Nucleic acid binder design. Structure first.
Ligand SMILES: [K+]
Ligand SMILES: [K+]
Ligand SMILES: [K+]
Ligand SMILES: [K+]
Ligand SMILES: [K+]
Ligand SMILES: [K+]
Ligand SMILES: [K+]
Ligand SMILES: [K+]
Ligand SMILES: [K+]
Ligand SMILES: [K+]
Ligand SMILES: [K+]
Ligand SMILES: [K+]
Ligand SMILES: [K+]
Ligand SMILES: [K+]
Ligand SMILES: [K+]
Ligand SMILES: [K+]
Ligand SMILES: [K+]
Ligand SMILES: [K+]
Ligand SMILES: [K+]
Ligand SMILES: [K+]
Ligand SMILES: [K+]
Ligand SMILES: [K+]
Ligand SMILES: [K+]
Ligand SMILES: [K+]
Ligand SMILES: [K+]
Ligand SMILES: [K+]
Ligand SMILES: [K+]
Ligand SMILES: [K+]
Ligand SMILES: [K+]
Ligand SMILES: [K+]
Ligand SMILES: [K+]
Ligand SMILES: [K+]
Ligand SMILES: [K+]
Ligand SMILES: [K+]
Ligand SMILES: [K+]
Ligand SMILES: [K+]
Ligand SMILES: [K+]
Ligand SMILES: [K+]
Ligand SMILES: [K+]
Ligand SMILES: [K+]
Ligand SMILES: [K+]
Ligand SMILES: [K+]
Ligand SMILES: [K+]
Ligand SMILES: [K+]
Ligand SMILES: [K+]
Ligand SMILES: [K+]
Ligand SMILES: [K+]
Ligand SMILES: [K+]
Ligand SMILES: [K+]
Ligand SMILES: [K+]
Ligand SMILES: [K+]
Ligand SMILES: [K+]
Ligand SMILES: [K+]
Ligand SMILES: [K+]
Ligand SMILES: [K+]
Ligand SMILES: [K+]
Ligand SMILES: [K+]
Ligand SMILES: [K+]
Ligand SMILES: [K+]
Ligand SMILES: [K+]
Ligand SMILES: [K+]
Ligand SMILES: [K+]
Ligand SMILES: [K+]
Ligand SMILES: [K+]
Ligand SMILES: [Mg+2]
Ligand SMILES: [Mg+2]
Ligand SMILES: [Mg+2]
Ligand SMILES: [Mg+2]
Ligand SMILES: [Mg+2]
Ligand SMILES: [Mg+2]
Ligand SMILES: [Mg+2]
Ligand SMILES: [Mg+2]
Ligand SMILES: [Mg+2]
Ligand SMILES: [Mg+2]
Ligand SMILES: [Mg+2]
Ligand SMILES: [Mg+2]
Ligand SMILES: [Mg+2]
Ligand SMILES: [Mg+2]
Ligand SMILES: [Mg+2]
Ligand SMILES: [Mg+2]
Ligand SMILES: [Mg+2]
Ligand SMILES: [Mg+2]
Ligand SMILES: [Mg+2]
Ligand SMILES: [Mg+2]
Ligand SMILES: [Mg+2]
Ligand SMILES: [Mg+2]
Ligand SMILES: [Mg+2]
Ligand SMILES: [Mg+2]
Ligand SMILES: [Mg+2]
Ligand SMILES: [Mg+2]
Ligand SMILES: [Mg+2]
Ligand SMILES: [Mg+2]
Ligand SMILES: [Mg+2]
Ligand SMILES: [Mg+2]
Ligand SMILES: [Mg+2]
Ligand SMILES: [Mg+2]
Ligand SMILES: [Mg+2]
Ligand SMILES: [Mg+2]
Ligand SMILES: [Mg+2]
Ligand SMILES: [Mg+2]
Ligand SMILES: [Mg+2]
Ligand SMILES: [Mg+2]
Ligand SMILES: [Mg+2]
Ligand SMILES: [Mg+2]
Ligand SMILES: [Mg+2]
Ligand SMILES: [Mg+2]
Ligand SMILES: [Mg+2]
Ligand SMILES: [Mg+2]
Ligand SMILES: [Mg+2]
Ligand SMILES: [Mg+2]
Ligand SMILES: [Mg+2]
Ligand SMILES: [Mg+2]
Ligand SMILES: [Mg+2]
Ligand SMILES: [Mg+2]
Ligand SMILES: [Mg+2]
Ligand SMILES: [Mg+2]
Ligand SMILES: [Mg+2]
Ligand SMILES: [Mg+2]
Ligand SMILES: [Mg+2]
Ligand SMILES: [Mg+2]
Ligand SMILES: [Mg+2]
Ligand SMILES: [Mg+2]
Ligand SMILES: [Mg+2]
Ligand SMILES: [Mg+2]
Ligand SMILES: [Mg+2]
Ligand SMILES: [Mg+2]
Ligand SMILES: [Mg+2]
Ligand SMILES: [Mg+2]
Ligand SMILES: [Mg+2]
Ligand SMILES: [Mg+2]
Ligand SMILES: [Mg+2]
Ligand SMILES: [Mg+2]
Ligand SMILES: [Mg+2]
Ligand SMILES: [Mg+2]
Ligand SMILES: [Mg+2]
Ligand SMILES: [Mg+2]
Ligand SMILES: [Mg+2]
Ligand SMILES: [Mg+2]
Ligand SMILES: [Mg+2]
Ligand SMILES: [Mg+2]
Ligand SMILES: [Mg+2]
Ligand SMILES: [Mg+2]
Ligand SMILES: [Mg+2]
Ligand SMILES: [Mg+2]
Ligand SMILES: [Mg+2]
Ligand SMILES: [Mg+2]
Ligand SMILES: [Mg+2]
Ligand SMILES: [Mg+2]
Ligand SMILES: [Mg+2]
Ligand SMILES: [Mg+2]
Ligand SMILES: [Mg+2]
Ligand SMILES: [Mg+2]
Lengths: 148, 209
RNA sequence: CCUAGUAACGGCGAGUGAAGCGGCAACAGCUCAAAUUUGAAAGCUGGCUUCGGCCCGCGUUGUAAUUUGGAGAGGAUGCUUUGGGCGAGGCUCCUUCUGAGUUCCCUGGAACGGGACGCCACAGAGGGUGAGAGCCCCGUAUAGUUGGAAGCCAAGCCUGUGUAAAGCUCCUUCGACGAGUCGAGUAGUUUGGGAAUGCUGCUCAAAAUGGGAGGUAAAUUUCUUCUAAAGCUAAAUACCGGCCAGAGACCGAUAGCGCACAAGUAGAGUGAUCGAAAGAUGAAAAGCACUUUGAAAAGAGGGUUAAAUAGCACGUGAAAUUGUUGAAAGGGAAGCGCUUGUGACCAGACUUGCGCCCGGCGGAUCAUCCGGUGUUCUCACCGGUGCACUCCGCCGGGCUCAGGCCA
RNA sequence: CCGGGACCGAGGACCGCGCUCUGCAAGGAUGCUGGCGUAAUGGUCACCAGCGACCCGUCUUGAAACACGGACCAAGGAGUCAAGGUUUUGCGCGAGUGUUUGGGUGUAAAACCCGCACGCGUAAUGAAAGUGAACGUAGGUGAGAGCUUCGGCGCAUCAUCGACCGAUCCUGAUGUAUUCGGAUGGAUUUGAGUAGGAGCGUUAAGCCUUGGACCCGAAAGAUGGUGAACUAUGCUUGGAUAGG
RNA sequence: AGACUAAUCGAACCAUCUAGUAGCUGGUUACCGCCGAAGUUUCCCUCAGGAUAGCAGUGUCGACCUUCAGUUUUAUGAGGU
RNA sequence: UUAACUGAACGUGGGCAUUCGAAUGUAUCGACACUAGUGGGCCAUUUUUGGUAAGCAGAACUGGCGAUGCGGGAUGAACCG
RNA sequence: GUCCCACCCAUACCCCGCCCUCAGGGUAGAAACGAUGCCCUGAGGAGUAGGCGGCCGUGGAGGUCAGUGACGAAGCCUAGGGCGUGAGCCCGGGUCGAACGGCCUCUAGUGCAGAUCUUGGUGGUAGUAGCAAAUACUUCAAUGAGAACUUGAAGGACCGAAGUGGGGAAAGGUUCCAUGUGAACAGCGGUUGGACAUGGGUUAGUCGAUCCUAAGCCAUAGGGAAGUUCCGUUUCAAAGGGGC
RNA sequence: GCGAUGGCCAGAAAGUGGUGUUGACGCAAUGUGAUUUCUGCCCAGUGCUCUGAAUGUCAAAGUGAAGAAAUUCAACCAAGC
RNA sequence: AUUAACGAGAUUCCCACUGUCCCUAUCUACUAUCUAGCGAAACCACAGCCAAGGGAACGGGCUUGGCAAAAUCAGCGGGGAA
RNA sequence: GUGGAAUACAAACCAUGAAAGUGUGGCCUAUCGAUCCUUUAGUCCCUCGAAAUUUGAGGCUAGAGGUGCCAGAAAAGUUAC
């Protein structure tokens, strides 16, 4: 809103807060990113180091669908089970069956392993798996299998 | 110029952009126009539904090939399996697509069942009401409760596979011999060396004799 | 909409920049060239015509039927499919008709204002009428109703019939498919397109499982996917230029379009072209009859009006600048700050209030108790009793206290 | 220890420290008396008198300047709007968050309802092929608000030594498509990392960039048109100039 | 004669691109309260201009952290005016 | 590291206010975030360079004017209070 | 030149009152409070460029005062009053004729002395500079409200046939003639007018145009050019007219 | 400088134009400036012009060799210098 | 390098001539000037007497002195850094 | 406290001296150069995105070709119109 502005407060005062010696002229210093290597180098080197030059090789016609593989840690593996069924397993009331989890149906491709796993056997299906993640699933009494 | 720690700006406003600006103040007005046209179209197709029957089809990339959706039309092989002539099909509300092919048995079986479900629910009125033909409904069944959507009555029942199930313990499978991680490393390694190994075997056999 | 300010281009500087997938709006498919009708050019423009055709002409250097790659042609095989005519009934357009106060009092030139009493309402949107009107007038709401024309859709009925033409299931064999075109080199331009994305000029110039593409130039071997060099086609999309209509937290005559007016006008320029200023008397002209002075323009009387402090030089009528009347100052500027004096003009404040005692006058019913009803459950109100040393009001006399300004 | 003058009276029941203690000069003025009750006190304006007083705006080290603009009055007249960033304030939900591209519906551009995809966040690091976060009660030491059974436990945050993931440089086990595979243990190396998540949407302000960009101002450049009624040169066809 | 080409010529006139760009001159509209500067460092075809550090304001948070100081004293170093 | 548990760094346990070990002040402790204006200066005591000298040109420490009125120097940005 | 008394006044120092700013305390078994209030205590106050806070005004929007008004809304004038440190707010008197305000939120084309600022209006200068080339006027009478510049007569003068004479071409367009007339125009006057109002006026077989060709311009046959169009005029063309 | 298949000049192009109804006593491009008397020396430099024996330099196309090919390497080589 | 004739081309001397000068005087017409009628413009922060001082180093305004009396007409070219 | 020269260690391989030791250019204070592009050395490593093998091209780490206006544009005069 226009009534909350320092413009309203400058009415009656010469120079509108811009100075009497320097005057708020049109474009002292160039337009845009002009002068990056000449008189704006002090700014461009304190912040944004690495701005000028080339690094790496090119890739013509990159298709992003070739590189789709979202990941999930073992830390949150049990949160993919519905809440009521999840509490029965944790409290120790099933003791005869095991859950089978489909990572792809939830939108994940690779299983990483970051945290800990409770000692209840589970069956996991995945496209990729980490070396540590497979160790922790097997040690809990489970098994992972590959599905494409 | 730049004076503090900023993100380097790139605003593409160096042409005469003010000549090409499209506001949308007619969004509610255009919505009313569309609803009037749908209502008029439904009245013209008096007992018929307002849509066409579509098949089930799977998406094409490594991303999205886990899901299914609706396609353009049924193939010529699917229509023949159900027993519907290709000239009759588009005149009773079925879409046809002549450039899709059945590379598998899974897709073929799914769509063949879809067609004969539709054929069982169909009511055919005779061309002349005083001379019905043996392929028409005998008019005692012409009265029933009908549907007029065909996109809600024949939609995609489940686009994704179930994400969770249960099996009895001691029925869990055994893993692959070396482990899942080692199997992936070996499959990758074989592909990178298929050309080297084939050349080595060939020159060995040729030099053998 | 998202992909995405991403892959990529760029004195790799300043800067630039798409596409496939995914969700939705809207959905609709087709016809030619290349084959011998060969047991019968089966095709078409024009003229004259009882209306049934006749005559010349076009055309075999190819007019119809048949086929278009999803196929198809040629054979088997036995089932199925089709033509005319009525038509209730409904939709669109024009047109006729629609509820309730001019009731009483005051102000006013005139109620459409204030007060009192009523009525209508699927109608209290808007406008007019001598000032703010639901009921004075036009309209506004609702489904109906009188009359007229042309189209569209459509429940269902009445009739022929296989000469012919059409769909489906199988098969040994056949299966025609667009050339100075594709492609290659080179030059220019362009693109995000990078040993070259598209287009065009010049030179060379094809093939039959052949040909194009598969985003890093080249040879060898595989694979995937389509089928160029001929053609048609509604909807979702753009636009206020043209003809209509409905609106707004927009502007209110130096604003809003250059133009609210005889405005693209008057006027300027040889010409192309340039281009203004300018809205408002009063409800009603009732727009001043007559007399008198003046050569006349006009003045003075006298009229109209609620008003001429509204007279067409017209609502209201500010400032700069000017006239008359009244007050005042002035020995080479004036204006201004602090502080007295003189003259002129002026706002407040004060006028009594509470209390005590004595006398007169009038009215009640003061305290207490009984019944009823509330409510904060112990405090009240109403009815009854009370009835002169109680309670309330007024007047007359005396006393204390408090009250304005300067010392 | 006694005299003489000047200016001032804030506060508003009691409470306190005290003294010369029937009371008082001790946490802030009362008592008595006169005149007048209105232009008398007081206020506004005009004028004379004493003292004081250079023309404003602006650039500038320095303006009253012999530095520029300004004869007078009325009306108009200049930091805005959009997209994209950022820090801070308020609000909703919270490992999630965002209805409004679209559909349903309506008293119809409002209000109300729906959910498939998608965006940002939940995981980093390398040019890339690729790989991918717990020795320990999620570690030890020094401070640390608060709590505490008084023995201690110790949030946020700061300093310090280590542990885990990716990259770089070394080492090279069991095995074997005998040339593949890369276990285990190290290194004055390196990352916008892990080590009991903080984010998504919206409201208001300052700042930044592209845009006409706070308002008015060049000498120039380009695209398309109109002039030889003046004047320059030429062509066709006409006219004019005493007397010695 | 750089002379003339409609009072216009060392490149006519008219409309449009066009609100052409300006490190340069001019202006930039009510009141009160509190705080309060710089003309210096480094880099730039930089010298009438910018970025960068300093000087200034505003919002806070941690404890109300035995915490600090343009100063004196005591002990102990360096210097070539 | 040393011939060597000999050293080097980091510590457990125990002891030491009968005084936490100069003066004065504390009228203002620490850390963070975002940003404005400025980047032409001039004068003076003492010390100083070039120049015959200058109301000239150039430096160091400190105080002033710029940005500031008031009492003195009759007047007088910078002098005395 | 040196020494000694008394005295004069700064916005500085000391004591008192009042304003604001900053800091520190008190206030609920609530007889309680614009708790955003009230009570108690101490210190401080200069300022350009610049930063922040609080307040006052203007045009519109939602809500609310069951607000004011033809018995007088809004606007305008007023050496008449009251409130506020201030921007401002409120009332009295006069003029006038149809609408307008207070409070809390929302919103913006929202506050002027300057820009040789834009449009319009108005001063001093000032009854001032001036109304002086082309030889020149005088008498009587008539008209008329009014005669130097209107008409008659009589005098005096100039142009002096390369004229201030009599006719035409270009250009203008009724300026030509008669009757009448308030204002405006004829830089003095005006009864007069090329001004203002109402009517009238241009007559061809023989004078011109019309006919012919000149310098030149443009069609047709053809050739260029993406095209608006450029060239070409007798050509590389099957191009006519005369009688019965 | 030029004998028409030409010299000088115009046009985007043209089955297009000017000199030109022309032909060296002509057309075109420059300097000096009546008559009289004269008009010396310099070809190194910059220009203009001529001659091809010169293989020195040397484009695209064409030819040869190597290679699986893209390609690379050689000779030959117009005008101009 | 010369050169007859020609030139509103530049320069030096001589004769005649004269108000160019010693050295200035006088006359005529039209103005100016006064009156009736008619009637502008440039320009303007506010204004309009000096001497010195200091000051942005040449004041109409400031400081210390000199002084200082209504309203006005014809001319003038010092200043208003006109 | 951003971008020539200098100091002290760590891990290797060496040179000298009997040895302790000394040696990371000249006894100390000067003697020099970014992005883009090209070229060489290094591993035998990654990619050419339908799949393989050989040529070719592209990346990753370290030097060299240079900006003397030396924190680094590619650049001749005149105006008396
Ligand atoms: K500012
Ligand atoms: K990655
Ligand atoms: K994507
Ligand atoms: K025929
Ligand atoms: K045919
Ligand atoms: K009908
Ligand atoms: K009446
Ligand atoms: K009445
Ligand atoms: K009434
Ligand atoms: K080509
Ligand atoms: K192929
Ligand atoms: K390819
Ligand atoms: K206008
Ligand atoms: K005209
Ligand atoms: K009335
Ligand atoms: K009257
Ligand atoms: K009136
Ligand atoms: K006090
Ligand atoms: K200035
Ligand atoms: K001035
Ligand atoms: K926020
Ligand atoms: K999501
Ligand atoms: K504690
Ligand atoms: K590491
Ligand atoms: K801006
Ligand atoms: K002639
Ligand atoms: K002209
Ligand atoms: K400059
Ligand atoms: K010395
Ligand atoms: K040891
Ligand atoms: K700064
Ligand atoms: K700065
Ligand atoms: K300076
Ligand atoms: K100086
Ligand atoms: K002084
Ligand atoms: K407002
Ligand atoms: K009044
Ligand atoms: K006059
Ligand atoms: K005369
Ligand atoms: K004459
Ligand atoms: K005739
Ligand atoms: K005749
Ligand atoms: K004619
Ligand atoms: K004729
Ligand atoms: K001719
Ligand atoms: K043509
Ligand atoms: K020729
Ligand atoms: K010559
Ligand atoms: K000459
Ligand atoms: K000659
Ligand atoms: K000569
Ligand atoms: K020579
Ligand atoms: K020579
Ligand atoms: K020569
Ligand atoms: K001459
Ligand atoms: K005069
Ligand atoms: K006169
Ligand atoms: K002086
Ligand atoms: K003074
Ligand atoms: K430089
Ligand atoms: K250097
Ligand atoms: K430099
Ligand atoms: K030049
Ligand atoms: K010169
Ligand atoms: Mg200020
Ligand atoms: Mg300024
Ligand atoms: Mg600045
Ligand atoms: Mg993104
Ligand atoms: Mg983008
Ligand atoms: Mg572009
Ligand atoms: Mg057929
Ligand atoms: Mg067949
Ligand atoms: Mg009616
Ligand atoms: Mg009305
Ligand atoms: Mg009405
Ligand atoms: Mg009524
Ligand atoms: Mg084809
Ligand atoms: Mg082009
Ligand atoms: Mg190209
Ligand atoms: Mg409208
Ligand atoms: Mg107007
Ligand atoms: Mg207008
Ligand atoms: Mg008017
Ligand atoms: Mg009258
Ligand atoms: Mg009136
Ligand atoms: Mg008037
Ligand atoms: Mg009026
Ligand atoms: Mg006035
Ligand atoms: Mg006076
Ligand atoms: Mg009673
Ligand atoms: Mg008191
Ligand atoms: Mg008294
Ligand atoms: Mg008085
Ligand atoms: Mg004075
Ligand atoms: Mg001066
Ligand atoms: Mg100037
Ligand atoms: Mg001026
Ligand atoms: Mg206005
Ligand atoms: Mg929508
Ligand atoms: Mg240019
Ligand atoms: Mg002419
Ligand atoms: Mg001219
Ligand atoms: Mg502008
Ligand atoms: Mg301009
Ligand atoms: Mg201060
Ligand atoms: Mg540079
Ligand atoms: Mg300047
Ligand atoms: Mg702390
Ligand atoms: Mg503290
Ligand atoms: Mg020394
Ligand atoms: Mg500057
Ligand atoms: Mg100096
Ligand atoms: Mg100087
Ligand atoms: Mg300054
Ligand atoms: Mg001072
Ligand atoms: Mg003084
Ligand atoms: Mg002195
Ligand atoms: Mg202050
Ligand atoms: Mg507005
Ligand atoms: Mg009024
Ligand atoms: Mg007044
Ligand atoms: Mg009216
Ligand atoms: Mg404005
Ligand atoms: Mg003004
Ligand atoms: Mg101003
Ligand atoms: Mg005069
Ligand atoms: Mg005259
Ligand atoms: Mg004259
Ligand atoms: Mg006369
Ligand atoms: Mg004569
Ligand atoms: Mg004569
Ligand atoms: Mg006449
Ligand atoms: Mg007449
Ligand atoms: Mg006149
Ligand atoms: Mg007259
Ligand atoms: Mg007259
Ligand atoms: Mg006339
Ligand atoms: Mg004739
Ligand atoms: Mg032509
Ligand atoms: Mg042609
Ligand atoms: Mg060659
Ligand atoms: Mg040669
Ligand atoms: Mg003087
Ligand atoms: Mg002097
Ligand atoms: Mg002056
Ligand atoms: Mg004086
Ligand atoms: Mg004079
Ligand atoms: Mg003068
Ligand atoms: Mg060593
Ligand atoms: Mg040596
Ligand atoms: Mg280098
Ligand atoms: Mg590829």
């Amino acid at each position: 809103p226009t009534r909350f502005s320092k413009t309203r407060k400058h009415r009656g005062h010469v120079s509108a807060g811009k100075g009497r010696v320097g005057k708020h002229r049109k474009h002292p210093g160039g337009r845009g990113m002009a002068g990056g290597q000449h008189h704006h180098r002090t700014n461009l080197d304190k912040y944004h180091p690495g701005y000028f030059g080339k690094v790496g090789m090119r890739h013509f016609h990159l298709l992003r669908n070739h590189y789709w593989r979202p990941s999930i840690n073992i830390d949150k593996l049990w949160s993919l089970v519905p809440s009521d069924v999840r509490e029965q397993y944790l409290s120790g009331q099933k003791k005869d069956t095991a859950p089978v989890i489909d990572l792809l149906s939830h939108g994940y491709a690779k299983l990483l392993g970051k945290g800990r796993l409770p000692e209840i056997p589970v069956v996991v299906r995945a496209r990729y798996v980490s070396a540590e993640a497979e160790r922790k699933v097997k040690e809990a009494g489970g098994v992972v299998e590959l599905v494409a | 110029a730049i004076k503090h720690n900023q993100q380097i700006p790139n605003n593409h406003f160096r042409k005469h952009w003010q000549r090409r600006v499209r506001c949308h103040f007619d969004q509610p007005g255009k919505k009313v126009t569309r609803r009037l046209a749908r209502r008029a179209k439904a009245a013209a197709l008096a007992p018929r539904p307002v849509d066409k029957l579509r098949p089930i089809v799977r998406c094409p990339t490594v991303k999205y090939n886990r899901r299914t959706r609706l396609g353009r039309g049924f193939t010529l092989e699917e229509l023949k399996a159900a027993g519907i002539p290709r000239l009759l099909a588009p005149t009773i509300g079925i879409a046809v697509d002549h450039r899709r092919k059945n590379l598998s048995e899974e897709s073929l079986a799914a769509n063949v069942q879809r067609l004969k479900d539709y054929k069982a629910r169909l009511i055919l009125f005779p061309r002349k009401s005083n001379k019905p033909k043996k392929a028409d409904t005998p008019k005692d069944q012409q009265t029933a409760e009908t549907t007029t959507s065909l996109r809600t009555s024949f939609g995609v029942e489940q686009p994704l596979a179930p994400g969770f199930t249960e099996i009895s313990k001691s029925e869990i499978p055994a893993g692959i011999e070396g482990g899942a991680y080692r199997a992936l490393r070996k499959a990758r390694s074989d592909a990178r060396l298929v050309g080297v190994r084939e050349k080595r075997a060939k020159e060995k056999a040729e030099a053998e004799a």
